[PDB]
Design a protein around this ligand. Sequence first.
Ligand SMILES: COc1cc2nccc(Oc3ccc(-c4cnc(Nc5ccc(F)cc5)n(C)c4=O)cc3F)c2cc1OC
Ligand SMILES: COc1cc2nccc(Oc3ccc(-c4cnc(Nc5ccc(F)cc5)n(C)c4=O)cc3F)c2cc1OC
Lengths: 276, 272
Amino acid sequence: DLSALNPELVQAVQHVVIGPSSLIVHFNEVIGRGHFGCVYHGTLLDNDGKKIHCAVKSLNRITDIGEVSQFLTEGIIMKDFSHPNVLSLLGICLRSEGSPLVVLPYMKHGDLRNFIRNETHNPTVKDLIGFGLQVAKGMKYLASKKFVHRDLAARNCMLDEKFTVKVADFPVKWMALESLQTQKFTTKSDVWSFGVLLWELMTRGAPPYPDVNTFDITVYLLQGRRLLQPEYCPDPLYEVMLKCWHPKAEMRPSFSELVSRISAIFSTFIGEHYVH
Amino acid sequence: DLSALNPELVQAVQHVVIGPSSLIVHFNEVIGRGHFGCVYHGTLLDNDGKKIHCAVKSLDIGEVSQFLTEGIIMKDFSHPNVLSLLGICLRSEGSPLVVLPYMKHGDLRNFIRNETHNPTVKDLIGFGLQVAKGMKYLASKKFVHRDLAARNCMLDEKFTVKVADFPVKWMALESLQTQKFTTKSDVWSFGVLLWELMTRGAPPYPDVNTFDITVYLLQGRRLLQPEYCPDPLYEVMLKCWHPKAEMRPSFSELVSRISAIFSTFIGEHYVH
Ligand SMILES: COc1cc2nccc(Oc3ccc(-c4cnc(Nc5ccc(F)cc5)n(C)c4=O)cc3F)c2cc1OC
Ligand SMILES: COc1cc2nccc(Oc3ccc(-c4cnc(Nc5ccc(F)cc5)n(C)c4=O)cc3F)c2cc1OC
């Protein structure tokens, strides 16, 4: 419905809500491919009088109060995040006859996987390490807030005009061993996924374990087998990836540790095509 | 994992939280066999200071926030056939505690399966009518249960059925393929529940595998009429299992229909 919901919860989410008379969605201007849903070009008029171009995602017609309520508390959580490497929520739009709208800053270069996959772009080794370093900074921030991402991957990281990486969309070949067997997702589980994301970057967007099946991944990892060092990957960064794939979660590096480690490797490299 | 959450969400949950100083938990006095988790006998002091016998379930910011909003949702429901939430207790050192009114006769599946109990065909239909009324209430709130089953309904002292815990062999055909749950998806699960009641707690589809259940229902095979189930009630069951979600009856129509079937019987060992 619109507000067959709890008054206290509706009050809690108000600060996230965008009035539709300050939002224009160009439903004829699509930016999505499908992965994030159906995403459109938007124009948002803020309370400050500033008119900005944005991305607007249209939800499936959510049909029960349990779902709408979970959606709203997710919105509340994302609105609270404030880091340059974590994607911002501009707000949500609850309309009378139609599904809710999620309003996000426009991300000029789309997601990180597709940016590095097309031959038109030429990221250096340093550029790719840089993207991973930005991802780690955002993930360090999220961990500091006690927040598990649960779906870290290069496809789920966005790149703006200033080439700032935005962690978004907070998948068995990205999952930690314990997540595959015991179904447990922690901050150390995100460290494993980060490792896979680094591997993705240093291969420029190659699919992980391309010759192992989704159901065969668990037995593969119990053979001590890991993803092989990518062609753009430096030896010291590969040892970072291996540490991310330790089967015991407590034995993996923290994101705070990954930031200082990768940062040190990054500072040794020179030559960039995509700065900031 | 303390309240370093969004202040407005924390203020939204305040009406649901119980001050731990009004609660004693008997951690050495255990309730149940683990289906509902770690449940214990508790004593709760209400707003007037009245002692109330309760059951106490012992449970990242994302999970804790969703837990809180589910508590906000549950605390809002007010219907005799829906399990009420007395509150939640968010301790300084330890897991959140969920506080529920004590249900004397536990879950419905265990109660009917017990040979010591002698529910009549009318009693079992009555228990189904109670489930339907709670579900009609939930449907009216636009709320989907998602896990309706005999094991997930409770029985109190006055033999009031309380729908709780809001499972492939209870799942609707479109849930087994599209992963989508609706109020009509709940109607299907209710039919399996009615079947559970009439067979006095027999496992459904006992010979078929968990993964072979979707192809089983696609063939048009269903649960056979329970030995001691009335013909018009098995028709209700079959209507609840209609392959077209929109062709199944509403819980409002289930109430009235089952109310009628119930009324054509006499003989109750468990009166409500
Ligand atoms: C140039 O090309 C693109 C540009 C883009 N620009 C901006 C966003 C894009 O895609 C998206 C990224 C992110 C999310 C996203 C939505 N909601 C939540 N959470 C959320 C939950 C509940 C709630 F109430 C509010 C929020 N999260 C965690 C998200 O990551 C949605 C998206 F459509 C772009 C995509 C593009 O190409 C595909
Ligand atoms: C004597 O025999 C028994 C007696 C009992 N008496 C009273 C409760 C029992 O079991 C329970 C029933 C229900 C729930 C239950 C908890 N939380 C939620 N949701 C919820 C989410 C978040 C939030 F913050 C609060 C709430 N729901 C939807 C529930 O159904 C928990 C239970 F332990 C009893 C069990 C017994 O035998 C095992």
